[PDB]
mmCIF file of C-alpha atoms in Angstrom:
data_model
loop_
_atom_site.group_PDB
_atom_site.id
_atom_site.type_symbol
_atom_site.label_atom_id
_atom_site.label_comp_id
_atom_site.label_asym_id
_atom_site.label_seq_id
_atom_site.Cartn_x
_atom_site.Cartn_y
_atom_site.Cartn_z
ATOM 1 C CA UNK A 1 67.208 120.346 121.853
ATOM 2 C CA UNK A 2 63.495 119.972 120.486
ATOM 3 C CA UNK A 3 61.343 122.754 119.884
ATOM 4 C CA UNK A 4 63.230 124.821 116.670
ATOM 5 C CA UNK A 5 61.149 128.136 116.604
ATOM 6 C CA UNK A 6 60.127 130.759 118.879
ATOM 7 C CA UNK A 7 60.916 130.732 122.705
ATOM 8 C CA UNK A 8 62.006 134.361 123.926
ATOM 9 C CA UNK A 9 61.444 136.171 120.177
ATOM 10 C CA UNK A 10 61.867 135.015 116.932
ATOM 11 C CA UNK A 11 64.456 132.462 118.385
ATOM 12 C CA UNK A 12 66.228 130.019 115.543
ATOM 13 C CA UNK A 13 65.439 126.079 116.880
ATOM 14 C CA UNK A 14 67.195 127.344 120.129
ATOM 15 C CA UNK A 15 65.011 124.950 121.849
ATOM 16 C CA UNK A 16 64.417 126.826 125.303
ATOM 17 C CA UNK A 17 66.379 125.332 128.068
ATOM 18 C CA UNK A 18 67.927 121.902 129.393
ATOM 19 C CA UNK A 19 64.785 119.216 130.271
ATOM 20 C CA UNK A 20 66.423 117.208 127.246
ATOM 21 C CA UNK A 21 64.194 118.030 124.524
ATOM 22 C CA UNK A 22 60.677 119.470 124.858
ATOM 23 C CA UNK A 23 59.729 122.900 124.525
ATOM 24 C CA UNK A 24 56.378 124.777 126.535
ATOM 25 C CA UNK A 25 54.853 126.835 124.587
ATOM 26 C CA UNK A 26 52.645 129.667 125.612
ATOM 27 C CA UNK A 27 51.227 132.865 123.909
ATOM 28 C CA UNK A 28 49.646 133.645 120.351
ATOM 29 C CA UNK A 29 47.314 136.006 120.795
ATOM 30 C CA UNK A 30 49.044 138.500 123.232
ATOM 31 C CA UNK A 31 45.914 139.763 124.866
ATOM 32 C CA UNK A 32 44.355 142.053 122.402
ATOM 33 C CA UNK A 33 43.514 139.251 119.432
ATOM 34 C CA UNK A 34 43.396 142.692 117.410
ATOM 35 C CA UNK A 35 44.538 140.400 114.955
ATOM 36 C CA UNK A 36 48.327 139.463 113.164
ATOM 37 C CA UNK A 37 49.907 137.076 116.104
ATOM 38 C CA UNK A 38 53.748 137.632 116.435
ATOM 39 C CA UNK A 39 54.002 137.852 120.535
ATOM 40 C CA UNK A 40 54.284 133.787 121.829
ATOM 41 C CA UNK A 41 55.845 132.621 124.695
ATOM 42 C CA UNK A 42 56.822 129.245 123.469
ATOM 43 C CA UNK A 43 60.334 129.103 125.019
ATOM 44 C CA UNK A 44 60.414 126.194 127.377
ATOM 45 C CA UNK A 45 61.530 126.970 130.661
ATOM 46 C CA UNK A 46 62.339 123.549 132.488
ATOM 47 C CA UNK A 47 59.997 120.599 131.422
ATOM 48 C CA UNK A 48 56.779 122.577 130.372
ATOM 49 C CA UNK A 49 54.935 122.824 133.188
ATOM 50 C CA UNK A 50 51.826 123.146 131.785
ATOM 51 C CA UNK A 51 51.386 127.006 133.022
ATOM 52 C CA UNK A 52 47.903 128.014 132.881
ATOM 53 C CA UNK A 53 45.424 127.940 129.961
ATOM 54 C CA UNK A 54 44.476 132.090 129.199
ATOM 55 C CA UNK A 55 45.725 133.133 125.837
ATOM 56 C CA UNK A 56 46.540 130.345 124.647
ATOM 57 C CA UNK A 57 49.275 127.572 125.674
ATOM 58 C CA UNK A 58 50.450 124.121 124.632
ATOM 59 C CA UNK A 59 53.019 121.312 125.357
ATOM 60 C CA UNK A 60 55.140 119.678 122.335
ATOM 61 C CA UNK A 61 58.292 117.591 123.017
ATOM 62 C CA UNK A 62 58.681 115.671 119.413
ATOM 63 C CA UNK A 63 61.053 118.098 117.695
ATOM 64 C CA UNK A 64 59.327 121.489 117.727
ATOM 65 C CA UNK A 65 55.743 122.824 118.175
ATOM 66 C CA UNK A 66 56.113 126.536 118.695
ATOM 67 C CA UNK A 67 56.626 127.923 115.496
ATOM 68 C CA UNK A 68 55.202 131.133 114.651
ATOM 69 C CA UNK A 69 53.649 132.421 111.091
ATOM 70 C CA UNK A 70 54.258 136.133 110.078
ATOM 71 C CA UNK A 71 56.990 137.207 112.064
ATOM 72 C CA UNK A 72 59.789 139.578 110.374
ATOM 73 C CA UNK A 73 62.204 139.105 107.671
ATOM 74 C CA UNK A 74 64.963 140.738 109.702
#
Protein backbone atom coordinates (compact mmCIF):
# COMPACT_ATOMS: atom_id res chain seq x y z
CA UNK A 1 0.00 0.00 0.00
CA UNK A 2 1.70 3.34 -1.32
CA UNK A 3 2.69 3.82 -4.72
CA UNK A 4 -0.99 3.82 -6.86
CA UNK A 5 0.31 3.67 -10.55
CA UNK A 6 2.53 1.65 -12.58
CA UNK A 7 4.65 -1.31 -11.17
CA UNK A 8 4.59 -4.39 -13.69
CA UNK A 9 2.28 -2.41 -16.60
CA UNK A 10 -0.25 -0.05 -16.37
CA UNK A 11 -0.97 -1.45 -12.78
CA UNK A 12 -4.12 0.39 -10.83
CA UNK A 13 -2.46 1.76 -7.18
CA UNK A 14 -1.48 -1.99 -6.77
CA UNK A 15 1.37 -0.70 -4.86
CA UNK A 16 4.14 -3.41 -5.73
CA UNK A 17 4.75 -5.75 -2.92
CA UNK A 18 4.72 -6.04 1.05
CA UNK A 19 7.68 -3.47 2.65
CA UNK A 20 4.47 -1.62 4.12
CA UNK A 21 4.11 1.15 1.83
CA UNK A 22 6.79 2.46 -0.55
CA UNK A 23 7.09 1.73 -4.04
CA UNK A 24 10.81 1.65 -6.27
CA UNK A 25 10.44 2.94 -9.19
CA UNK A 26 12.62 2.37 -12.18
CA UNK A 27 12.30 2.93 -16.01
CA UNK A 28 10.90 5.87 -18.29
CA UNK A 29 12.77 5.96 -21.06
CA UNK A 30 13.15 2.20 -21.99
CA UNK A 31 16.47 2.50 -23.70
CA UNK A 32 15.76 4.04 -27.00
CA UNK A 33 14.38 7.74 -25.65
CA UNK A 34 12.91 7.59 -29.35
CA UNK A 35 10.47 9.51 -27.63
CA UNK A 36 6.55 8.75 -26.04
CA UNK A 37 7.59 6.93 -22.51
CA UNK A 38 5.07 4.11 -21.60
CA UNK A 39 7.76 1.19 -20.52
CA UNK A 40 8.63 1.98 -16.41
CA UNK A 41 9.58 -0.32 -14.00
CA UNK A 42 8.16 1.38 -11.01
CA UNK A 43 6.76 -1.73 -9.24
CA UNK A 44 8.47 -2.01 -5.92
CA UNK A 45 9.95 -5.18 -5.28
CA UNK A 46 10.80 -5.34 -1.41
CA UNK A 47 11.83 -1.89 0.12
CA UNK A 48 13.30 -0.11 -3.04
CA UNK A 49 16.58 -0.91 -3.07
CA UNK A 50 17.80 1.77 -4.82
CA UNK A 51 18.82 -0.48 -8.06
CA UNK A 52 21.16 1.31 -10.18
CA UNK A 53 20.88 4.76 -11.81
CA UNK A 54 20.85 3.99 -16.07
CA UNK A 55 17.56 4.94 -17.56
CA UNK A 56 16.25 6.46 -15.13
CA UNK A 57 15.14 5.34 -11.43
CA UNK A 58 13.72 6.83 -8.25
CA UNK A 59 12.51 6.03 -4.65
CA UNK A 60 8.95 7.42 -3.35
CA UNK A 61 7.27 5.96 -0.22
CA UNK A 62 4.54 8.92 0.58
CA UNK A 63 1.55 7.49 -1.29
CA UNK A 64 2.66 7.02 -4.90
CA UNK A 65 5.47 8.35 -7.18
CA UNK A 66 5.42 6.13 -10.22
CA UNK A 67 2.76 7.27 -12.22
CA UNK A 68 3.05 7.27 -15.82
CA UNK A 69 1.60 9.96 -18.54
CA UNK A 70 0.31 8.59 -21.95
CA UNK A 71 -0.29 5.14 -21.40
CA UNK A 72 -3.56 3.46 -23.07
CA UNK A 73 -7.15 3.94 -22.61
CA UNK A 74 -7.76 0.19 -22.55
Amino acid sequence: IVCHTTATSPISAVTCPPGENLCYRKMWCDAFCSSRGKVVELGCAATCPSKKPYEEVTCCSTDKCNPHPKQRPG
